[PDB]
Amino acid sequence: GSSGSSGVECPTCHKKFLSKYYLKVHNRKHTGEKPFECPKCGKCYFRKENLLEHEARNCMNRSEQVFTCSVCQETFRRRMELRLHMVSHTGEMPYKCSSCSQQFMQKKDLQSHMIKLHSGPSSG
Ligand SMILES: [Zn+2]
Ligand SMILES: [Zn+2]
Ligand SMILES: [Zn+2]
Ligand SMILES: [Zn+2]
């Protein structure tokens, strides 16, 4: 049935990809001991409660690579989206700017933003 094409393969789930890059980032999950994991698909869930929900909320199903929240188990076809969504759970992003008052998830992400956008090689 389902077929793929020239590319790498996951020595864990046996899932081929277009480029190693994706394969690696994908394996990120596999690695790292976990307490529980959906016995239907294989989604590790630190908290049991979360695991149970998911099973009902959503499970393995031929569909575009999406992301699942960690509080409401939402659905995001993109990674960044989830990041901009999590803020709703914690009010707002963990990091913020001062000149523009931007928002970021990482400290370095902000510092660099102020060192390039605010402190770029241009005078604009
Ligand atoms: Zn895999
Ligand atoms: Zn599942
Ligand atoms: Zn959420
Ligand atoms: Zn800024």
PDB file of N, CA, C and O and ligand atoms in Angstrom, residues 9-17 23-24 26-30, ligand 1:
ATOM      1  N   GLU A   9      15.876   6.608   6.671  1.00  0.00           N
ATOM      2  CA  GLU A   9      14.897   5.770   7.353  1.00  0.00           C
ATOM      3  C   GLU A   9      15.167   5.727   8.853  1.00  0.00           C
ATOM      4  O   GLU A   9      16.319   5.664   9.286  1.00  0.00           O
ATOM      5  N   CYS A  10      14.098   5.761   9.642  1.00  0.00           N
ATOM      6  CA  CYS A  10      14.219   5.727  11.095  1.00  0.00           C
ATOM      7  C   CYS A  10      14.410   4.297  11.591  1.00  0.00           C
ATOM      8  O   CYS A  10      13.545   3.435  11.427  1.00  0.00           O
ATOM      9  N   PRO A  11      15.568   4.036  12.215  1.00  0.00           N
ATOM     10  CA  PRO A  11      15.899   2.712  12.750  1.00  0.00           C
ATOM     11  C   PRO A  11      15.052   2.348  13.963  1.00  0.00           C
ATOM     12  O   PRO A  11      15.316   1.356  14.644  1.00  0.00           O
ATOM     13  N   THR A  12      14.029   3.156  14.230  1.00  0.00           N
ATOM     14  CA  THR A  12      13.144   2.919  15.362  1.00  0.00           C
ATOM     15  C   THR A  12      11.733   2.577  14.895  1.00  0.00           C
ATOM     16  O   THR A  12      11.211   1.504  15.197  1.00  0.00           O
ATOM     17  N   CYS A  13      11.122   3.495  14.153  1.00  0.00           N
ATOM     18  CA  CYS A  13       9.771   3.291  13.644  1.00  0.00           C
ATOM     19  C   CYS A  13       9.802   2.866  12.178  1.00  0.00           C
ATOM     20  O   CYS A  13       8.796   2.415  11.630  1.00  0.00           O
ATOM     21  N   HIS A  14      10.965   3.010  11.550  1.00  0.00           N
ATOM     22  CA  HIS A  14      11.128   2.639  10.149  1.00  0.00           C
ATOM     23  C   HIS A  14      10.358   3.593   9.241  1.00  0.00           C
ATOM     24  O   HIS A  14       9.684   3.168   8.303  1.00  0.00           O
ATOM     25  N   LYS A  15      10.463   4.887   9.527  1.00  0.00           N
ATOM     26  CA  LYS A  15       9.778   5.903   8.736  1.00  0.00           C
ATOM     27  C   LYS A  15      10.769   6.689   7.883  1.00  0.00           C
ATOM     28  O   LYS A  15      11.569   7.468   8.401  1.00  0.00           O
ATOM     29  N   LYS A  16      10.710   6.479   6.573  1.00  0.00           N
ATOM     30  CA  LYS A  16      11.599   7.169   5.646  1.00  0.00           C
ATOM     31  C   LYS A  16      11.185   8.628   5.478  1.00  0.00           C
ATOM     32  O   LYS A  16      10.014   8.971   5.628  1.00  0.00           O
ATOM     33  N   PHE A  17      12.155   9.480   5.163  1.00  0.00           N
ATOM     34  CA  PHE A  17      11.891  10.902   4.975  1.00  0.00           C
ATOM     35  C   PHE A  17      12.560  11.415   3.703  1.00  0.00           C
ATOM     36  O   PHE A  17      13.238  10.665   2.998  1.00  0.00           O
ATOM     37  N   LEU A  23      14.485  13.593   9.502  1.00  0.00           N
ATOM     38  CA  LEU A  23      14.605  12.313  10.191  1.00  0.00           C
ATOM     39  C   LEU A  23      15.181  12.500  11.592  1.00  0.00           C
ATOM     40  O   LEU A  23      14.626  12.007  12.574  1.00  0.00           O
ATOM     41  N   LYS A  24      16.297  13.218  11.676  1.00  0.00           N
ATOM     42  CA  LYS A  24      16.947  13.475  12.956  1.00  0.00           C
ATOM     43  C   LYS A  24      15.979  14.130  13.936  1.00  0.00           C
ATOM     44  O   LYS A  24      15.630  13.547  14.962  1.00  0.00           O
ATOM     45  N   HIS A  26      13.050  14.297  13.962  1.00  0.00           N
ATOM     46  CA  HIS A  26      11.926  13.401  14.214  1.00  0.00           C
ATOM     47  C   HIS A  26      12.272  12.388  15.301  1.00  0.00           C
ATOM     48  O   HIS A  26      11.468  12.123  16.194  1.00  0.00           O
ATOM     49  N   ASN A  27      13.474  11.826  15.220  1.00  0.00           N
ATOM     50  CA  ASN A  27      13.925  10.842  16.197  1.00  0.00           C
ATOM     51  C   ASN A  27      14.013  11.458  17.589  1.00  0.00           C
ATOM     52  O   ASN A  27      13.940  10.754  18.597  1.00  0.00           O
ATOM     53  N   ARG A  28      14.169  12.777  17.638  1.00  0.00           N
ATOM     54  CA  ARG A  28      14.267  13.489  18.908  1.00  0.00           C
ATOM     55  C   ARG A  28      13.351  12.861  19.954  1.00  0.00           C
ATOM     56  O   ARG A  28      13.734  12.694  21.112  1.00  0.00           O
ATOM     57  N   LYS A  29      12.136  12.517  19.539  1.00  0.00           N
ATOM     58  CA  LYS A  29      11.164  11.908  20.440  1.00  0.00           C
ATOM     59  C   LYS A  29      11.638  10.535  20.904  1.00  0.00           C
ATOM     60  O   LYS A  29      11.847  10.310  22.096  1.00  0.00           O
ATOM     61  N   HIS A  30      11.808   9.620  19.954  1.00  0.00           N
ATOM     62  CA  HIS A  30      12.260   8.269  20.267  1.00  0.00           C
ATOM     63  C   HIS A  30      13.229   8.279  21.446  1.00  0.00           C
ATOM     64  O   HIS A  30      12.974   7.657  22.478  1.00  0.00           O
TER      65      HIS A  30
HETATM   66 ZN    ZN B   1      10.975   7.252  14.108  1.00  0.00          ZN
END
